[PDB]
Amino acid sequence: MDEVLATSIGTYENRTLLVPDGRLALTALHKGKDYQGKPMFYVLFELTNTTEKTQNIQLMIQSFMEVSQTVHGKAQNLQYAVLTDSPFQDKLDRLADEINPGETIQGAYPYEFINENKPVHFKFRDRLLSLDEPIASEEITIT
Numbered sequence: 001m002d003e004v005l006a007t008s009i010g011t012y013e014n015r016t017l018l019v020p021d022g023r024l025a026l027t028a029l030h031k032g033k034d035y036q037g038k039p040m041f042y043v044l045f046e047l048t049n050t051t052e053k054t055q056n057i058q059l060m061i062q063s064f065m066e067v068s069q070t071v072h073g074k075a076q077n078l079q080y081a082v083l084t085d086s087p088f089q090d091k092l093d094r095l096a097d098e099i100n101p102g103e104t105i106q107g108a109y110p111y112e113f114i115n116e117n118k119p120v121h122f123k124f125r126d127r128l129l130s131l132d133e134p135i136a137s138e139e140i141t142i143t
């Protein structure tokens with residue numbers, strides 16, 4: 001026992017996240033505009049519901065990939081970003097819709113981008129007994 005992360009299960013590379021809970025796969029992140037026609041970002045990922053439930057989707061993504069930026073000299077959990085009107089309203093409703101347990105699909109999950117000037121710590125973890133740091137991590141500069 002070399003104290004492996006996530007007990008050697010999931011991985012993060014090749015623009016894709018493999019896990020037992022599901023099967024996330026980054027297709028192509030795209031940036032947009034919100035109420036302030038600036039702070040806005042879309043997380044284009046391929047969340048495949050491997051489970052057997054038709055419950056909401058956000059109930060899974062909230063345990064798959066999390067995002068947190070800096071503010072007031074501390075780290076905060078980036079929540080759903082509000083926007084007036086965007087073309088990606090279809091994939092957006094996903095968070096407020098159900099999933100396809102056993103089918104191949106994808107969706108999105110935008111959040112507060114006010115800190116567009118700051119890097120977005122793209123982390124990936126899951127309830128697979130980790131504790132000692134998430135499955136992985138990588139910083140990216142979008143927008």
